[model samples]
Target: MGNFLYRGISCQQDEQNNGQLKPKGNKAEVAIRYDGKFKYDGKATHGPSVKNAVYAHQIETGLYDGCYISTTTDKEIAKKFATSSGIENGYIYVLNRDLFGQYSIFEYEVEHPENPNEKEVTIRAEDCGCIPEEVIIAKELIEINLEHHHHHH
Candidate 1:
């Protein structure tokens, strides 16, 4: 009966750095993730029960390939929002969800910003008033990634 926010990349587009036939730098892929919460809308047969939980979510800001360079710093705000939204804990992954509810895992890049490297913390989800186990797992993965990538001279 905990609230959760699941974000999965839906689409991507490559953008050139400069207006040239062949750009010198790498291209940026714009990816979009669907963000939602687990809240009951009062229409389920369970009638306010945990089984009647619904996902009231929206699309997150479109992300570019290198634009996520600020993900670590950005996570601060994201975590705040998640806490406010009532998300207790969950994993952040890259997926492609179609209109038919068919989703495919494309990538799995854990959040690990460079400026202020920190592990994920617990936060509240928007609605269900509960917590999920994925939050800790995701945090552990991020910590591992941070340690593994540390001092890569």
Candidate 2:
């Protein structure tokens, strides 16, 4: 009874903190809301968690203000996005947007990095104070191969 989405989270490190090799420390962690409800299911690589936004007072600015979680409605592209991010231990998480109660969700198209002709939908949820209580995990967590190498696409 809700919208389904996929999110990519890499445990290995990336450019966010500096030139670090492994980003596993960033492995997604479940976020609990102010009201003790599930907020976000995992941590984002480059943005503030909805829990952090609670004190920031800028959660409502949403995607426009970069206060949101990046996800996709398409599973395959989501897999590509995570694995191709030059990261190991990357995971693709399927989420169901139910019980969120009331919140803002926005969608837009992103040109696939490997194929410009192809486009994928990216979903963002504004990390507001009143973020929905339930952002349930809908499927098995996908674990990418640590040695997953790509041939030039």
Candidate 3:
């Protein structure tokens, strides 16, 4: 079975910033773990058959919540997500832990400046992979921080 990496970026309120939007209730924890397998079932007649399979799987399974799945590559999706998140515009980083673990971090800006209905924006995932354990750590950190802030105020 081939390993496909899934990356997702979500929004959390910047507590330090007075007017920044914080998590609605409690910030949903980031889910990172190796949970699925990547399979290529489409005909290989086209060049992007494999890529198309990856995109279809990711979208059908809701593997990456709050993320969009478009006809694009993982690399491109990362860039778009990062840009939408208002994070630094640079090459997205994918960390491979061991032989079975992997994860990615990027920014995503969901708000649209000109359109109201088209406000929500997401990155189209292009591949599938097992979630990494580090995602737990990152999620815990975010939740703890949000909880602490909730108690502070």
Which regions in candidate 1 have their CA more than 4 angstroms from the true location? Answer: 1-46, 50-73, 78-127, 138-153
TM-score of each predicted structure versus truth: 0.17, 0.36, 0.23
After the best TM-score superposition of candidate 2, give how far the Cα of residue 25 lies from its true spot, in angstroms. Answer: 22
Model 2, residue 122: distance off in Å is: 3.9
Q: Which stretches of candidate 2 lie over 4 Å from their true place?
A: 1-4, 11-66, 71-73, 87-92, 97-120, 128-133, 138-153
**lDDT string, candidate 1, 38-70, tens digits:** 232343244322222222111122223221112
Task: Tell me the lDDT of candidate 1.
Answer: 0.27
Model 2 — TM-score against the truth?
A: 0.36
- Tell how far residue 42 is off in model 3, in angstroms: 9.6
Better of 1 and 3 by TM-score: 3
- Candidate 1: 10-residue stretch with minimal lDDT: 136-145
List the RMSD of every prediction in angstroms: 18.6, 11.5, 15.5
* lDDT for each residue of candidate 2 in 1-153, tens digit (9 for 90 to 100): 355565544532442353322222322335444344435434554455434453244424443332334445444655565557743354444555553335444434566676555554444444332133245354243554534455553
Which residue pairs in model 2 clash with each other? 11-23, 11-24, 12-23, 12-24, 13-22, 13-23, 100-132
Q: Pairing residues by index, what is the TM-score of model 1?
A: 0.17
| lDDT (0 to 1) per candidate | 0.27, 0.43, 0.33
Clashes per candidate, residues 3 or more apart or on different chains: 11, 7, 13
